[PDB]
Design a binder for this molecule. Structure first.
Ligand SMILES: COc1cc(Nc2ccnc3cc(C#N)ccc23)cc(OC)c1OC
Length: 378
């Protein structure tokens, strides 16, 4: 009862609940509650959707389309995606967010925490949980920024043999509406049933891309979500639609992180500790167990990038260690600077996709290539 009771309340603030779930990576049976909320189809009425459209794309917005699907295909973090076709026959996907979602952030976040605190299920983590939550939700609402990020990433991936970013339809974009070209295929959410051979090459290319986003582009998504990676079986390509929480970082800052991964693969615990303190992962005076919990959680990363043999991300053991790559918050109060939080969250979220898809492939070659390019720039 209390279960379905909580679920029903959290759906009224679905975006905040899910974003909070990402920050803690799914503990009690609250993981079920979050999953149920993730499956909940609490969509905003069409009237509301038509309001944001007419109030952003103009009263004659439907004059631009041959067809507008009234039933949403799926729910976004804050909006929902409706499929449509433009007057010329071009198939597109329109992500429409609701009016005032940005002004409802503080109220929704507080309602979320009130539900969780009252339920006495939260791990009861630190103040810092609200500040980061309101910050990430504000970023997702800025669809104009999201559009710009998508155009930039599309250029970075120009001519790539596996990844591509769908083009943006500026004619149908706005602060509350983001429209892209239709993509063929399905999100990796529904790719568990694919061949072990397909899933290994999908995840191999995702992890290589992860290394480039971190140490070559310096332009990465904070929380990777396999629901936003569409796999096209016909073309054997992956369409990238996960650019809602994108940020840039100084090459010097990401250079400290690659030194940590270097040391991790070299089993140099002291350098991992020293550079970790330099990045403010650690303050240097964390109790022995808190520091060892952070250094231990990193061993899994060094294990993969140091093995010239295939690394199995889907094992029960490795899977559990990959889900614990968020020790950055547990009993851990300047907080871990949001820049540091996002870098380790990009790496860990990438390993997570490899684990959920039960992927297995070598990882040493791709990192030595990434570290080589680093030394060249240096
Ligand atoms: C993750 O976020 C987004 C997801 C989508 N979904 C889609 C995009 C393109 N083709 C699709 C085809 C089908 C089919 N059958 C279903 C969904 C599609 C669109 C977005 O922007 C317009 C997003 O936001 C950036």
């Amino acid at each position: 009862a209390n279960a379905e009771r909580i679920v029903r309340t959290l759906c009224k603030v679905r975006g905040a609940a899910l974003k909070l779930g990402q920050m803690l990576s799914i503990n009690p049976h609250l993981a079920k509650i979050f999953e149920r909320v993730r499956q909940s189809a609490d969509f905003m009425p069409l009237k509301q959707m038509m309001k944001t459209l007419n109030n952003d794309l103009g009263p004659n917005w439907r004059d631009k389309l041959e067809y507008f699907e009234e039933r949403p295909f799926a729910a976004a973090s804050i909006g929902q995606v409706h499929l449509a076709r433009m007057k010329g026959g071009r198939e597109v996907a329109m992500k429409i967010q609701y009016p005032g979602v940005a002004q409802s952030i503080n109220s929704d976040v507080n309602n979320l925490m009130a539900v969780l605190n009252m339920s006495n299920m939260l791990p009861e983590g630190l103040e810092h949980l609200i500040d980061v939550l309101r910050r990430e939700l504000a970023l997702e609402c800025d669809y104009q920024r999201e559009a710009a990020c998508a155009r930039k990433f599309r250029d970075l991936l120009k001519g790539h043999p596996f990844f591509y970013v769908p083009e943006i339809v500026d004619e149908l974009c706005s602060p509350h509406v983001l429209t892209t070209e239709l993509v063929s295929g399905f999100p990796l959410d529904q790719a568990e049933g694919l061949s072990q051979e397909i899933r290994n090459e999908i995840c191999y290319n995702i992890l290589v891309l992860c290394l480039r986003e971190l140490f070559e582009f310096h332009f990465m998504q904070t929380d990777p979500n396999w629901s936003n990676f569409f796999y096209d079986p016909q073309q054997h390509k992956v369409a990238l639609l996960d650019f809602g929480a994108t940020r840039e970082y100084d090459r010097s800052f990401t250079d400290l992180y690659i030194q940590i991964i270097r040391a991790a693969a070299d089993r140099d615990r002291e350098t991992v500790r020293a550079k970790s303190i330099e990045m403010k992962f650690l303050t240097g005076y964390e109790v022995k167990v808190m520091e060892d919990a952070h250094l231990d959680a990193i061993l899994i990363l060094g294990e993969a990038f140091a093995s010239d043999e295939p690394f199995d991300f889907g094992t029960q053991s490795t899977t559990e260690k990959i889900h614990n790559l968020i020790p950055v918050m547990l009993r851990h109060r300047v907080p871990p600077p949001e820049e540091t939080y996002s870098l380790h969250r990009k790496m860990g979220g990438s390993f997570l996709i490899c684990s959920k898809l039960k992927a297995r492939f070598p990882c040493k070659a791709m990192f030595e290539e990434a570290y080589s390019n680093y030394c060249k720039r240096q």
